[PDB]
Amino acid sequence: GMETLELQGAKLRYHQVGQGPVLIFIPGANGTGDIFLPLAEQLKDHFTVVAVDRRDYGESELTEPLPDSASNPDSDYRVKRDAQDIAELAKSLSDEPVYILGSSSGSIVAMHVLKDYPEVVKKIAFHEPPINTFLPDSTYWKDKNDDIVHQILTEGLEKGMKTFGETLNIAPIDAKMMSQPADTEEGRIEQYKRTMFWLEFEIRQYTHSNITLDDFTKYSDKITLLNGTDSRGSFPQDVNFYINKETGIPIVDIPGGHLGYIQKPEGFADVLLNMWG
Amino acid sequence: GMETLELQGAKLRYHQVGQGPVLIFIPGANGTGDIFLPLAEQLKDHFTVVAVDRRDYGESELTEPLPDSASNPDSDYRVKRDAQDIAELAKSLSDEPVYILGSSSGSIVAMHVLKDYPEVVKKIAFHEPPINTFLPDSTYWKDKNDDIVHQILTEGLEKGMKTFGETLNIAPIDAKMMSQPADTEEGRIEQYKRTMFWLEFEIRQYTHSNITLDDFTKYSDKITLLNGTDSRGSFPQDVNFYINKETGIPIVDIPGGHLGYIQKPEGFADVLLNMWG
Ligand SMILES: [Mg+2]
Ligand SMILES: [Mg+2]
Ligand SMILES: [Mg+2]
Ligand SMILES: [Mg+2]
Ligand SMILES: [Mg+2]
Ligand SMILES: [Mg+2]
């Protein structure tokens, strides 16, 4: 139902109503053009209104993953790519310069359209821009932005991962290993990504997944439960004790803690070789 | 040097060392099989050890996006797909059923391998599983996991944004609107994901991007700055006041606040028509 312009790295989706000169609306934080549609109706008798879903939002779709560096707070990839999207969009819709309005971060995209593709711009409006780079007090506002993101993404994550470990009674040596930062900045950003992904897409879905005790009894001859010798008292050992209680499936104790296969790989292997090998 | 198995929706990468019967190791929250390589070193004379990067982690890569519903906490797409990955890997490497060990969430994957693809399992070991579904106190453990994830992915965001709105003196009209929850659970999930994306990938990058007052003055004839009439005292209006003081570029007042285009679309359109119609 939405129009599409295929660009390098994305299919850009946009609403288009009206007749007349082109007027491109660039959204802020919500990312999507639908917030402009009530406005577009008031205007459709005077402009061909184009309301964009920026490529990372809404119905637009990336055709390749974001570059890993986009996570850096001084990355310029996305803002420049958004501006180039609007310029390519204007060129595809019009042989003349067009009207552009951006709001909030969308007004920042519009600033970059004017800077890098002024030939597509007839008139432009910046609705309540939050850019701080050229301000006398730029550093104050930049630091506030940096600190709020740090608070939410990193502080919120470290405090909740500590809460997980205490909720499950994880042994210190396990807690430490599992929350240990990566020795490189690229490793640390990956480690953040991978943890957020686990929190959002794995922990809840897997720990309440569809497994019953009957699934264990049907194949009890195949199964060994393993409890670490250095992780006693933790919730995962209680899960195994329950399985054992209800099914008779054996528990074999194995060196190390929750991470004993890396903590004590010699001792872990010996148990497995005796079990199976 | 990693091996590859091309499956539906992903290229599954794994380490393969040793010789004899296949023994697949399924990692937990770290997602990657390198954590088993010291253990593999100790096992490689008795087993062909296979240590998997689950498809969402490490050197594995998706070739199709995840389903939108994977974010839902009762989704079971990912655990079932992980389990299917292990099963196809076993059939690719061995004509005999194989040995399997998983730890932590990897042990839950192993559980679904036994449930759905028992034919590929010779023997299987569940090292310290944190699954709670079949426990007599499942509700306690399930609701604790749900609370902690919610805290991080949504509430730490909600609290940080309120302090951020006070720092920028965002008008109550706009704060209420920007933080109004969606009328659907899945709609609220998408809201939070969108805001978390903006937080990580947009606010810092865009607000400290490379725009100077010189970029404006080159084209002062094209530009209108817009301030809402219901968002007085907010930081984005201070940015427009600075640009106007330094360059003379006009500010035009327009109905509504920071989201004035959806708050008062008729009055917003009236001003834009005065400007460009
Ligand atoms: Mg190309
Ligand atoms: Mg909530
Ligand atoms: Mg920069
Ligand atoms: Mg002020
Ligand atoms: Mg008029
Ligand atoms: Mg005019």
Side-chain angles (χ1 to χ4, degrees), chain A residues 141, chain B residues 169 233-235 238:
Chain A
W141 296 103
Chain B
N169 203 28
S234 63
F235 163 74
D238 285 345

Side-chain angles (χ1 to χ4, degrees), chain A residues 54 57 78 82 104-105 112 115 121 128 132-133 202 206-210 215 221-222 228 231 258, chain B residues 54 57 78 82 104-105 112 115 123-124 128 132-133 201-202 206-209 215 222 228 231 258:
Chain A
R54 288 196 281 112
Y57 306 83
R78 282 195 60 251
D82 277 354
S104 203
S105 57
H112 284 269
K115 189 180 186 141
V121 182
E128 299 202 347
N132 66 53
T133 322
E202 188 151 303
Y206 288 36
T207 59
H208 208 64
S209 60
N210 175 51
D215 295 318
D221 278 321
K222 279 182 180 350
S231 37
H258 202 51
Chain B
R54 288 199 278 111
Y57 300 96
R78 279 199 60 251
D82 275 351
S104 209
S105 73
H112 286 270
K115 169 170 208 143
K123 298 260 160 239
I124 193 160
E128 306 216 337
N132 66 57
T133 323
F201 292 96
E202 184 143 319
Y206 283 38
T207 59
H208 207 60
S209 65
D215 294 323
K222 310 150 97 77
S231 40
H258 199 51

Side-chain angles (χ1 to χ4, degrees), chain B residues 9 14 24 47 66 71 76 84 94 102 107 125-126 155 207 227 243 246 253 264 267:
Chain B
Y14 61 95
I24 304 179
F47 294 97
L66 297 174
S71 42
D76 76 334
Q84 191 182 346
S94 181
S107 79
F126 305 139
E155 291 164 4
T207 59
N227 277 351
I243 298 170
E246 293 289 326
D253 293 327
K264 295 142 127 193

Side-chain angles (χ1 to χ4, degrees), chain A residues 4-6 22 44 56 60 180 183 203 213-214 221 231 238:
Chain A
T4 298
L5 169 62
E6 292 191 11
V22 163
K44 63 176 180 198
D56 289 283
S60 291
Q180 172 109 33
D183 54 358
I203 196 288
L213 291 168
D214 321 279
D221 278 321
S231 37
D238 287 339

Side-chain angles (χ1 to χ4, degrees), chain B residues 138-192:
Chain B
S138 172
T139 305
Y140 174 97
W141 298 108
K142 176 189 186 270
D143 285 347
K144 281 262 46 173
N145 286 341
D146 287 356
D147 289 346
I148 301 173
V149 175
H150 201 73
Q151 150 147 327
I152 295 173
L153 305 212
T154 88
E155 291 164 4
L157 170 57
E158 280 177 42
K159 288 137 196 311
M161 291 292 93
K162 163 262 289 143
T163 63
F164 196 61
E166 287 287 284
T167 300
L168 273 76
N169 203 28
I170 294 303
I173 42 149
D174 293 314
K176 164 189 208 194
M177 265 213 161
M178 283 174 322
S179 74
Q180 198 93 228
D183 76 19
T184 285
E185 241 193 317
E186 293 154 356
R188 298 200 272 291
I189 287 174
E190 163 220 293
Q191 293 185 311
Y192 294 140

